Amino acid sequence: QAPAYEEAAEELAKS
Secondary structure (H helix, E strand, C coil), rough: CCCCCCCHHHHHCCC
């Protein structure tokens, strides 16, 4: 599942 963590995965690499 993706509990508001999959969106942070893109923000982590795109930081």
